[PDB]
Amino acid sequence: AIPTNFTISVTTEILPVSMTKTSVDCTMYICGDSTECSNLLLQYGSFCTQ
Amino acid sequence: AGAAAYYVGYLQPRTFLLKYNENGTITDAVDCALDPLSETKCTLKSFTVE
Numbered sequence: 001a002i003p004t005n006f007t008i009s010v011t012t013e014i015l016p017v018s019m020t021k022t023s024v025d026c027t028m029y030i031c032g033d034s035t036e037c038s039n040l041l042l043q044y045g046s047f048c049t050q
Numbered sequence: 051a052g053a054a055a056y057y058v059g060y061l062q063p064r065t066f067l068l069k070y071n072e073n074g075t076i077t078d079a080v081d082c083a084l085d086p087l088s089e090t091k092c093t094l095k096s097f098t099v100e
């Protein structure tokens with residue numbers, strides 16, 4: 001079976017390229033605005049540096 | 051009177067990043083919350099920023 005005609009088909013495909021960049025502040029997330037809590041968070045500072 | 055001078059400053063609650071050298075003497079420090087550069091040094095736990 002040999003074709004005797006043709007069609008020019010345009011297909012659309014979508015690909016995600018990136019996602020929303022995000023940043024997090026340990027101090028104001030965990031220890032919202034209290035100094036007493038933020039002092040206790042210093043010993044865990046390494047974790048946030050991760 | 052003699053020829054002596056003195057200076058008075060007031061301590062405040064601050065976070066500091068101190069550097070202990072090989073012989074165990076504090077050779078340098080960074081005042082966290084002094085300026086944005088020292089703030090980044092405080093956040094990244096280093097005395098240099100790339």
Ligand SMILES: *[C@@H]1O[C@H](CO)[C@@H](O)[C@H](O)[C@H]1NC(C)=O
Nearest residue numbers: 070071072073074075076077
């Ligand atoms: C540290 O102490 C050793 C001797 O114990 C000395 O040779 C060296 O010069 C000292 N280095 C600094 C930076 O103080």
